[PDB]
Amino acid sequence: ALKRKIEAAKMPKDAREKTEAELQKLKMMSPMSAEATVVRGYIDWMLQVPWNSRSKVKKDLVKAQEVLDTDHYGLERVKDRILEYLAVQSRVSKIKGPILCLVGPPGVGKTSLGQSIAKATGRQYVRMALGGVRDEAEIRGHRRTYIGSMPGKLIQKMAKVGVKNPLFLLDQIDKMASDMRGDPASALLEVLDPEQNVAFNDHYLEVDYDLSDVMFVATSNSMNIPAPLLDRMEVIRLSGYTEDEKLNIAKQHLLPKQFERNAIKKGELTIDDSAIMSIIRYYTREAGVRSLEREISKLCRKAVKNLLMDKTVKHIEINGDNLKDFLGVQKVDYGRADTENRVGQVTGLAWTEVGGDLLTIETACVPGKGKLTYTGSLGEVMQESIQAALTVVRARADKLGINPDFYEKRDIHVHVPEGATPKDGPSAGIAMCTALVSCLTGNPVRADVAMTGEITLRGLVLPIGGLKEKLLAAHRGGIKVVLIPDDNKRDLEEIPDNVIADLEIHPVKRIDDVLAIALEHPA
Amino acid sequence: ALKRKIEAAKMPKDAREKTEAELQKLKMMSPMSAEATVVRGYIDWMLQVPWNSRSKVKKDLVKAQEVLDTDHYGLERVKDRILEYLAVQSRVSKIKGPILCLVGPPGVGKTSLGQSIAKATGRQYVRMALGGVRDEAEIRGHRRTYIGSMPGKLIQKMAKVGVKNPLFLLDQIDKMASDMRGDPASALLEVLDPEQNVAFNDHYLEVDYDLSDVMFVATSNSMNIPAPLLDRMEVIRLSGYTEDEKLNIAKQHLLPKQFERNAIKKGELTIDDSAIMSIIRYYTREAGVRSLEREISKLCRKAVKNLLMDKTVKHIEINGDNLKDFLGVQKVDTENRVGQVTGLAWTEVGGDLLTIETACVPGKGKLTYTGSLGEVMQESIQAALTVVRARADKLGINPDFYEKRDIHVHVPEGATPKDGPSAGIAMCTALVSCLTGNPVRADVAMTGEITLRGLVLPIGGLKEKLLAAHRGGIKVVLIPDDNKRDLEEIPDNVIADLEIHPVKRIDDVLAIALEHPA
């Protein structure tokens, strides 16, 4: 009865020898006894686990890109990765299966992207959530000595799905526990090992199980992953969304499904680009699209109750002026450029994970005793950057037309007026220097100029990180000319075309180029 | 054996096949065993988890708004949200359960509001207090290999109700300890994500469970919730109450609730309006109504005791003057001062007034800050003093005041910590006033952040600051120019009583809030 199940679900060599040796051990037992229950539990756990069953992975690349574009918008690098997997899989009968780590801010669609991938490749879909998981026996299990023992949840999900080609979605791989009491992140170090998945030995089913064709896609919010795990995964960085692609996600994906979730017919509610872009500019302040679809869903349910409570107006048209009639007061406000050329203030470009933002930097240089105060919730690298900038102004103050004993006679206060927000990094340093020169000369910084870059005591401008959201923040803010470092010219290769067309972008190499461009008068 | 309860439960395919594989496995086991006890425990949990039971929800909106208006007063944004849900629900069959986050001060009415939503939408009610939840095993549970293994506490309350659509009141989300010793806030990410509510996957019940049909209303006292949870939750801000709102809540909702709590019949106890207003002004200073039903509960049980001691009288009348006969002493309670302003402060408890005092004596330039100040407020006084040093010859100060005067900025808070940029303009007003002898006119509060060029930047928590200024006797309130868009969310009596002045820079502030022209 059982040996036809063992021969039916055909195994490899060691699993068949272990299972038939286990049944031959069961043949000399009483049927209603504890060791018979442990042996029968090991046998039917060896029978539920798939050994040879697979799934026909798709081969058409055009229809696969049609599915990937049907579910999500943008995300070209991960879609390239899936189409390249389907090309190599179209040539080779069996390959190792990719191990991917999707890393990005929340709401950018990396959990639903997994089910999009499993639909577009034909592979079956398996999800396992690792958020806050502390027990390592969720992965490997326990020995069959223990009462009520069973394999790890990976083997349970493999036995549930029935095939040896699933897509595992490892949700929150960085929010796993890692201490002395619990470390499943080092238990995943065997199952994500790209060479040793051919023999995954867990604790209940002590045979070697092959996991060298399961596609692993892990989702995390940060690089706070142990360095052995990061080295075993292929990191794809999902950056935040811009205004145009939030407009396209809203028009192409969020509005039709929120119309579908609310029984809104085609001739009841209409939302144009003015309302969508007004939600993006004045209500969200996010990197994802989740509060965006919460605002859209709020518009839809308010439209529903306004179609039920009135029942004499049967078409509601939402646009740029009547959002406050539905959504209310604008929650946020983006930074804008200044209108007049003012002595002492510059506009650096700041970048957080929410996105880029303008960064006003102001300086007062009152006559005093050389006091140096720096306020505005500054970091320590930022304050070292202001000290370096002040040293560059101080060693160059004869050329700049500055009275060289200002370090004795004048008190300098660098302030960044957001106040409650902590701010750190050397990328404001060039900006700091410019502000100081203005506040030592009365030569006002022209307000249409933003800048970014790191300063050295020689006077040189060093590269910085994250130009794309800084330039999008300057384009949103109304800046017409920015100042990037020289060795970030390569990053200009991946900027959209309207941003390059609108911004007069000047790469700089040293500080007197910046003081030549960003000041109103010659220094 | 037990298949009558399995087919009697009408389970879905994976749960039915798994529990009948477990029961079929149980029959070939010998009884009186340990693992047979484990299997009977697991079947005993899966026979009492709701798989099909669904409560019929209410389609009527007028009866619904009648219910939420009969058991609460003026929580208009939340009651609007529930009418939105019940308006969408009449057009389709099933919706994902809305995931809400009620954020407000204590006593503002967030838990009883969950009882009101439960009684009004037709759903059943159970609450899970998240205060003190320190590990994921209270959400996902343990494997049945372990000895004391139960299916978390979500599935225990789903089984405790017995329906597929309850109203979980996830109470006190911000009271969770989510450090490295245990992070249950990361386990709620699967509970609150619509991408994965159709497969919850408890550790004890490894069958995928459907949480998409459960309405999630969660309560918090602040926005200090971790950011992957803030995205999955629609936050509704509930603000504090005025005095006439507290009078209407007390007179329309709290006094009847206390009368048939302490079995006071028709004509025994009578409390007028002035006694309630004297409890509001003289025995409370909160933003909620916790202490109102505390003091009213004291009045009711002292009334019942005074009716059982002395049966000569059959009616007790309380009129604002004999509150000393019941509560005893009261608990909590003008000229133009030089170097003293009253800024507005907004804690998580609510709004509060904020006295700010300076003293510029002849010294050598020291600069001392007292009053348990945060580092951002100290930087705000440094920025404010820099604004004063920048325009010294304009304002009429001798420009040697940085080296011939020394300045003490004290807030008479005492032992309460205070932090934020929002008092900054207040600082420099006092910094003008003590350096020129021009008295600050004492009916003026002010709020706003200091820019070194002299501008006034927006502040948050405007409504609670205006409510704190309305119960403090303030008449003129100086406001940043970019918060005037919030002025159409304020109660009309607050806008009617307070005189609001939106200002753009320091010269407007000194031109309004100083007595003599500068």
Binding site: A34, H142, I147 | -
Partner: peptide, 7 residues
Amino acid sequence: AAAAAAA
């Protein structure tokens, strides 16, 4: 009667 180790 038979002993059995639990975790």
